[PDB]
């Protein structure tokens, strides 16, 4: 497999919130938030197992981040190398007037390079 092969597109969602790109929360709806991240993947080695790790980052005004939550899952790429994975973070207390972003990394269980 070409080391450069592979794409992850991610869409974050919050339970019982309909907003997207970005998700918007009222200050009252910040306690025990259930964040899902939908990972659309393409050009992964079909039928191979990946360690999918998502990271909920607090993004400060100066562009630096601090990780507040993380979730990892053994997943399998569809045989076509395209498909979808879902990831949900443990319940999180978020802060009013703050901005959060989700990172995603997929590493194959096997050495495919």
């Amino acid at each position: 497999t070409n080391p450069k092969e592979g794409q992850l597109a991610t869409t974050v969602s919050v339970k019982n919130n309909e907003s997207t790109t970005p998700v918007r929360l009222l200050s009252k709806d910040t306690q025990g938030v259930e964040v899902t991240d939908t990972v659309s993947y393409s050009d992964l080695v079909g039928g191979k197992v990946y360690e999918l790790t998502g990271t909920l980052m607090q993004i400060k005004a100066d562009g630096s981040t601090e990780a507040i939550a993380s979730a990892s899952k053994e997943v399998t790429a569809e045989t076509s190398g395209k498909g979808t994975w879902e990831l949900t973070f443990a319940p999180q207390n978020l802060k009013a007037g703050e901005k959060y972003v989700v990172y995603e990394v997929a590493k194959s269980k096997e050495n495919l390079v």
Binding site: P3, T10, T21, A96
Partner: peptide, 23 residues
Amino acid sequence: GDTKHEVRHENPQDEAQTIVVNK
């Protein structure tokens, strides 16, 4: 091969990946 296949999406400005809290 000697290493793992690593695909990352780590874009701090991706709106799709962003939650904004009001107040």
